[PDB]
Amino acid sequence: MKEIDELTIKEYGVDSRILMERAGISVVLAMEEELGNLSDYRFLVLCGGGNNGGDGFVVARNLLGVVKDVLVVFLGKKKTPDCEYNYGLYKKFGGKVVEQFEPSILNEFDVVVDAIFGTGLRGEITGEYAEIINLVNKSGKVVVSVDVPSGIDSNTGKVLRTAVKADLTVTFGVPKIGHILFPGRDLTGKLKVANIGHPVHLINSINRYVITREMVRSLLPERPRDSHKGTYGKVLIIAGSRLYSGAPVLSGMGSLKVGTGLVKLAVPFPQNLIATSRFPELISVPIDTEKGFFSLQNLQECLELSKDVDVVAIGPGLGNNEHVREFVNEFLKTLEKPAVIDADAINVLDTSVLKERKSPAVLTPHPGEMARLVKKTVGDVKYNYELAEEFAKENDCVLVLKSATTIVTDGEKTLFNITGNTGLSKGGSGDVLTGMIAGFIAQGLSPLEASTVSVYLHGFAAELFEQDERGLTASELLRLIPEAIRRLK
Amino acid sequence: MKEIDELTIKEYGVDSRILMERAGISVVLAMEEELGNLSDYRFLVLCGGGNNGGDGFVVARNLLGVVKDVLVVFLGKKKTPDCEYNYGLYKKFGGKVVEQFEPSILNEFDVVVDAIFGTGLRGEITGEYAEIINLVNKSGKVVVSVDVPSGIDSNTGKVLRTAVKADLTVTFGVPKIGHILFPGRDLTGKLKVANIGHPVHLINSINRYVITREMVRSLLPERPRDSHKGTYGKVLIIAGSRLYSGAPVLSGMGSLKVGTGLVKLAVPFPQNLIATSRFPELISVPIDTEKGFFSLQNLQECLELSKDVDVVAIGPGLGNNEHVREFVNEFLKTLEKPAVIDADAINVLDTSVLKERKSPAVLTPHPGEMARLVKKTVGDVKYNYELAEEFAKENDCVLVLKSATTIVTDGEKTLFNITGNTGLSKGGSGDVLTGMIAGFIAQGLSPLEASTVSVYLHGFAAELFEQDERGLTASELLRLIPEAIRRLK
Amino acid sequence: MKEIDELTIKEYGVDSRILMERAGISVVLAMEEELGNLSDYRFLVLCGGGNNGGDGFVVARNLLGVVKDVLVVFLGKKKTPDCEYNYGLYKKFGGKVVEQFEPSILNEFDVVVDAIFGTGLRGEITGEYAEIINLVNKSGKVVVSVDVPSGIDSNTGKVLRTAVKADLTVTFGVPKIGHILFPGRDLTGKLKVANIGHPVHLINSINRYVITREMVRSLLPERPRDSHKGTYGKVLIIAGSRLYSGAPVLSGMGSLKVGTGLVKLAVPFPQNLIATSRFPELISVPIDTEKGFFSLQNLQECLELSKDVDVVAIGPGLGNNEHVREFVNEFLKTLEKPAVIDADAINVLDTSVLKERKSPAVLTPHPGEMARLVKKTVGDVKYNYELAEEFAKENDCVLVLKSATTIVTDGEKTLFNITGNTGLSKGGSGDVLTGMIAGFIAQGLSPLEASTVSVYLHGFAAELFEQDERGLTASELLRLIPEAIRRLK
Amino acid sequence: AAWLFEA
Amino acid sequence: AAWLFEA
Amino acid sequence: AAWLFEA
Amino acid sequence: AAWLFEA
Ligand SMILES: [K+]
Ligand SMILES: [K+]
Ligand SMILES: [K+]
Ligand SMILES: [Mg+2]
Ligand SMILES: [Mg+2]
Ligand SMILES: [Mg+2]
Numbered sequence A, B, C: 001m002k003e004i005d006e007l008t009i010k011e012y013g014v015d016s017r018i019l020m021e022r023a024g025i026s027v028v029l030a031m032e033e034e035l036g037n038l039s040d041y042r043f044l045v046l047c048g049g050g051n052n053g054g055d056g057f058v059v060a061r062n063l064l065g066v067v068k069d070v071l072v073v074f075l076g077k078k079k080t081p082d083c084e085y086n087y088g089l090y091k092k093f094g095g096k097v098v099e100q101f102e103p104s105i106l107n108e109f110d111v112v113v114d115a116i117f118g119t120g121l122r123g124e125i126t127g128e129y130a131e132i133i134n135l136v137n138k139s140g141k142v143v144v145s146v147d148v149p150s151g152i153d154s155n156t157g158k159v160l161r162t163a164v165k166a167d168l169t170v171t172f173g174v175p176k177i178g179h180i181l182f183p184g185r186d187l188t189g190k191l192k193v194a195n196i197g198h199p200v201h202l203i204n205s206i207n208r209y210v211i212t213r214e215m216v217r218s219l220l221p222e223r224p225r226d227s228h229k230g231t232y233g234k235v236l237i238i239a240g241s242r243l244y245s246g247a248p249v250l251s252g253m254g255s256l257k258v259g260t261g262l263v264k265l266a267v268p269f270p271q272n273l274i275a276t277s278r279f280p281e282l283i284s285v286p287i288d289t290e291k292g293f294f295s296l297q298n299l300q301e302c303l304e305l306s307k308d309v310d311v312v313a314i315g316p317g318l319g320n321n322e323h324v325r326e327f328v329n330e331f332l333k334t335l336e337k338p339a340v341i342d343a344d345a346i347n348v349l350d351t352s353v354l355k356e357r358k359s360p361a362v363l364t365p366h367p368g369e370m371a372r373l374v375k376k377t378v379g380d381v382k383y384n385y386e387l388a389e390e391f392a393k394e395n396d397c398v399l400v401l402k403s404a405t406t407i408v409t410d411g412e413k414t415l416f417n418i419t420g421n422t423g424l425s426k427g428g429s430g431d432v433l434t435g436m437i438a439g440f441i442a443q444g445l446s447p448l449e450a451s452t453v454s455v456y457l458h459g460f461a462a463e464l465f466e467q468d469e470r471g472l473t474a475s476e477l478l479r480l481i482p483e484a485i486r487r488l489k
Numbered sequence D, E, F, G: 001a002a003w004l005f006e007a
Helices: A002-010 A016-035 A051-063 A081-092 A103-108 A127-138 A184-188 A200-204 A213-219 A247-257 A273-278 A296-307 A322-334 A343-347 A351-356 A367-374 A385-395 A429-442 A447-463 A474-488 B002-010 B016-035 B051-063 B081-092 B103-108 B127-138 B184-188 B200-204 B213-219 B247-257 B273-278 B296-307 B322-334 B343-347 B351-356 B367-374 B385-395 B429-442 B447-463 B474-488 C002-010 C016-035 C051-063 C081-092 C103-108 C127-138 C184-188 C200-204 C213-219 C247-257 C273-278 C296-307 C322-334 C343-347 C351-356 C367-374 C385-395 C429-442 C447-463 C474-488
Strands: A042-047 A069-074 A111-115 A142-146 A168-172 A190-194 A208-210 A234-238 A262-268 A283-287 A311-314 A339-341 A361-363 A398-401 A406-409 A414-417 B042-047 B069-074 B111-115 B142-146 B168-172 B190-194 B208-210 B234-238 B262-268 B283-287 B311-314 B339-341 B361-363 B398-401 B406-409 B414-417 C042-047 C069-074 C111-115 C142-146 C168-172 C190-194 C208-210 C234-238 C262-268 C283-287 C311-314 C339-341 C361-363 C398-401 C406-409 C414-417
Touching: A002 A016, A002 A200, A016 A051, A016 A081, A016 A111, A016 A142, A016 A168, A016 A190, A016 B016, A042 A051, A042 A103, A051 A069, A051 A081, A051 A111, A051 A142, A069 A103, A103 A127, A213 A447, A213 A474, A234 A247, A234 A296, A234 A429, A247 A262, A247 A273, A247 A429, A247 A474, A262 A273, A262 A296, A273 A283, A283 A296, A296 A322, A311 A322, A311 A429, A322 A343, A322 A351, A339 A429, A343 A367, A343 A429, A351 A385, A361 A447, A367 A385, A385 A398, A385 A406, A385 A414, A398 A447, A406 A447, A414 A447, A429 A447, A429 A474, A447 A474, B002 B016, B002 B200, B016 B051, B016 B081, B016 B111, B016 B142, B016 B168, B016 B190, B042 B051, B042 B103, B051 B069, B051 B081, B051 B111, B051 B142, B069 B103, B103 B127, B213 B447, B213 B474, B234 B247, B234 B296, B234 B429, B247 B262, B247 B273, B247 B429, B247 B474, B262 B273, B262 B296, B273 B283, B273 C273, B283 B296, B296 B322, B311 B322, B311 B429, B322 B343, B322 B351, B339 B429, B343 B367, B343 B429, B351 B385, B361 B447, B367 B385, B385 B398, B385 B406, B385 B414, B398 B447, B406 B447, B414 B447, B429 B447, B429 B474, B447 B474, C002 C016, C002 C200, C016 C051, C016 C081, C016 C111, C016 C142, C016 C168, C016 C190, C042 C051, C042 C103, C051 C069, C051 C081, C051 C111, C051 C142, C069 C103, C103 C127, C213 C447, C213 C474, C234 C247, C234 C296, C234 C429, C247 C262, C247 C273, C247 C429, C247 C474, C262 C273, C262 C296, C273 C283, C283 C296, C296 C322, C311 C322, C311 C429, C322 C343, C322 C351, C339 C429, C343 C367, C343 C429, C351 C385, C361 C447, C367 C385, C385 C398, C385 C406, C385 C414, C398 C447, C406 C447, C414 C447, C429 C447, C429 C474, C447 C474
Parallel strands: A042 A069, A042 A111, A111 A142, A142 A168, A168 A190, A208 A414, A234 A262, A234 A311, A262 A283, A311 A339, A339 A361, A361 A398, B042 B069, B042 B111, B111 B142, B142 B168, B168 B190, B208 B414, B234 B262, B234 B311, B262 B283, B311 B339, B339 B361, B361 B398, C042 C069, C042 C111, C111 C142, C142 C168, C168 C190, C208 C414, C234 C262, C234 C311, C262 C283, C311 C339, C339 C361, C361 C398
Antiparallel strands: A398 A406, A406 A414, B398 B406, B406 B414, C398 C406, C406 C414
8 A cells, every 4th residue: 555655646646745635634524424513523633743644734724614623733753745735734724733742631622633653653652652642542532543543553453552542543545454453453443444546446456355245245156046955065074073062063054054055964973963953954974983083994984975075174073182183184185175174173284284185275273273283372373464375375275364353365365354243252153164164165166265255254143143242152153144144135 | 716716826835736636526525425326327527628627637537447437528729737637647547538529429428527617718608619518408417517517607697608507516615606696596506515625714705695594593683581562673664555555565564474573554545454454463554645645745744653663664566656756755865764665666766865865775676676776777787796786885775686596785795695486476575575674674683684684584485385386475475484484493 | 089990990900800809808907907806796798789899798708717707788689790700709708698688687796897889879779778778877786888888979978868877987099078078977987098009190189188187287387497577477357346346356366376477456446455455465456437347438547557468367247237348348359468258258248359359369158158158058058169169260269168077179179177176166266267367378378278277277276175175165276276286296 | 007098 | 514515 | 325435 | 906917
């Protein structure tokens, strides 16, 4: 996007001042849409010395004469040319600026416009920058951040020591990664994305995006009327153990609720019987095991079962011991079908196996699993989209790194999912999503498409829960999936 | 307003390109508000070589990539610097321009954006300018005019040979006189007035304005609870004749429906009895006349009656013969109360009498009466606000020149009224308005204020008529006045 | 229409059987639209030997197998070729016919389809035709008449000794005069006009028509916003007398409620004062008369008053004595303005005066007045559209012959009005209509157009009366006119 | 819809 | 809300 | 209507 | 009403 600004100015010839005017008026219009009539409010505009501040000066100047009061506190040491020009206009128009902040100033104002730092943030915020942000955060006023809340690194969403918490953030052209990943997503509050005059071709050329309702609608497969279950694919799910008997059931129904034609589970006896007692629609094949876990002695039966399906999901509830490790790796090495690899199949995965596979794979780790898989800490991997992209590219797979914002990448294209809520923070949620992805692959979507549609619909189903989200469970999540699908069109 | 642009650029330092960008985006936003989503429409943008065209180039460029199709037809010979710059952007952004118009082109487009001429129109439109405008007018497409419909003189509202008929006109800063006076008011269609960044002080300094609901609300007098009829003034209306017995009744009720405390009519016997048979609230004093018209023999009785009132209205239904002329002029010469002079009192008025009066006056001519009064043709005086201003200033009065748009001026301040409809184009309407003005003066508003409030409320009452406007009559108009007042607050 | 059938068969080449099939199915569809599902009804179809009967045979045959029971009683002596063909089909399809009627037969049926006679009726109905029709009329069953209720002369609407009273009549191509004029209009019940495949050009070429809402909407004059009362015309009404003081008031308001700009009455003093006591909007000029009636001594004043108007209405309430006769005829002889001549101006009219007038005229007699005017009986003139046409053509005028169905003709084009109800059968109604016609002429409609719009709107206003129609009075009628106008668009 | 009947 | 348009 | 804001 | 069309 910094390339996008430069190109729009330097190659297309749009004056930088015109972009800056358009930016500031977008903020004014966005506030009006959010606050209603602005004429009864008093505005405190906090401007840095950069272009973010320059945007702020445009906001301030455009409120003059039209609202109850406007004051700018200019907190910088020097001004870029466009900030200087717009400061000059604000003052020519009769605007009041002060350069010294007083704790009590928040008193006489209703709205704070945060134009201190945007994408030009470098390093930790300290000093009077920090103090003013902390005063604004204690103040209880309405906070409107220009571009990105000051203190958020707009490439990562991390807080650089301290950051503004906004009610409303107005950003320009496209959402930035720091509005999408947490903690930044949290501090953004309600995000509006304004068109400020970049050519649409440049806006479209950004290679990381937010998964939207429109994108998922156009990816949903067709349901031709002359169809039968084979039309809609077959999934095998290899899952469960004597310890973890529920996982297979949730994965299997995950596949069925997204429209998959046939679902077969392979689960150790007698735990396989749990699935059909709950949903008799499922086929739950008994696997005779020595001690309640899959082992190499089940390899041959599982490949045989794999022959008559389109996709295999493996891992939920398998347990993690050495016999499971031998099985999972020898199976995936020999299986020539797309695989969705989750949970304990990730915990025991030998990543050399993924490189040698000719058939595709999707991996669905939470950060704990991703951390063990690449031998890093949870904090190194959490929201680390570049690491995710490297991993997907290096191993020829799709990586779905789960969290409140989920990252979906094949190494070239990366998508961010923002649907869902904390009712998904509970055992079982992941098991559902695994089945959904397998299901969509079986119905003919690519591994990346299947993953994109599934993470969106999984989170949207959670939001459709009628009662308090914290009471959501996986079984209720399953029942909500077909409603999410209907609301999607 | 051309001064307003120059000052904003040259003294305040706003780049002319920034004003032009703001203008064009206002047009885009206005269209969206009117058409809903723009993405399904094909736009034909007709651009002249001036700044209006330059505004058009901004519109075109901002629709690129976002709507179904955009084409510009550039109809000029050369381009001003800002039109040239914006033409350059449109083309840099991948925009298509052609310089030759083909009758069939209207075919493949849904919306025409008329950016041919704005306030820079000089002289009659001919040639391919004329033909293209006439083609657009026959086309049945949605027409959006930038600033002023091309072909309207924005200072007068006259059509310069031919002009665009717009569904929507977006103008900048303030409405222009040519949106307000006819035929221009008609060709404007729905007018939106966009803020494009002029300082509010400059926008406020314009000395001709449209009478608005807010202005009338703040002028309505107060009704203190501890009041009595004397609080609310007394009016004498000198009116009627054996030929015209209804006029007094309509004037008298006009005063009473706007809140006046006491109304007295002086009307020749027995025509005076007509008023109280209809509204017994009125006081209708019998004037003994020789042949059914006021004459000098009634001068003394009328001045006596004038002593106990605050304002005198004179003229409706008086008739126009020499004895009425002698009476009206000797009366007004001697009366030391505000006068509202209408109808036949205007037709016989000696304007030397107005100059010598110490007390104020409002005159309420339609253009026929104004024409006879200043010895010009109806076409010279109709909508001639400068002539009206000169007359008011020269004679120390307020002039209310009635028409679909009414002009109200004291020679320094001029206001335009745009409320009302064609149900007021019927005998009796004027008689009502005369009483309303007298009423408001009696209640303590200045002659200019009284006139401003009255023309607005009179037209607004007409619009509240429930059935087809052409069936409106004065008696129904009277009944609607208190509803107009209530809706005003 | 008999020409229309012949041409469609003989020149366009549509088989007569195809027209007859289309006719019969139209009847079936019309019954379904009126009765809902037909499958629970038993139908008795009464067929003559002509083409009406043939249509009936098509109805019968198309109900076979689909309704509870169908029986045809064939009452003729011989069958035309298309009746014979369709009789043959009915019987081939398993249909039951009998040729002897039994009083009790009505017993076992719910709907009677009357296909005995259509436009081929010649002379009085007697014998078993009469008896069967009288039995059907006493029966209380649902009656559906094919084309025209049998017994109505379809050219005049007269009953030929006896006739069927129908709940529903389905006619073909265009309404016939006998559905429009009474008593036939009454016996038709609800009329549906079916398209049976005549070329639209032939259907459009019929020279007598029903005045419709669409025709009146397209004739209503325009109300340009930049207008004034002069735009909308001026009317003079010469009316009233010491005996009849109300007539002028109703005529004058009739003109004002249809949108006329200025209305002046000339009425003998002091009766003129009645008008402005009721509606002060009116101008009511006092005419000094010897004994309370217009006479030749008022000729000069009335022509003078006529100079400044567009149209003159004359006659309501004038009285009918020799001095009124001299006045009316000398006035109309000299007046060079359109005249609307009503009531007592008709009773004294010398029709030689109408021939010699260069300016146009509309005459508005009820049949009593028309009878005296042409020296015939009321029964010779009532609903006699050919006599009306001859009169209009011979005297170069428009004739509006008032009755429940009003005839409006200029001798070339004739229109029938079917709006209104019996609340118009009360003194004053006519006086209103006179003013309406004058009004519309003043607004620029031709005498024929003015009359067409006025008779329609006058009757429609009557229908908008909220309470029982018999309580309608002229003053209420006036108040309803602007609502009729609004509902018309 | 008026192809068949004028009402 | 009237910052941009007076209607 | 989405010319200015994607929400 | 089903004389013409079965739907
Ligand atoms: K900021
Ligand atoms: K224009
Ligand atoms: K019949
Ligand atoms: Mg999991
Ligand atoms: Mg007047
Ligand atoms: Mg009559």
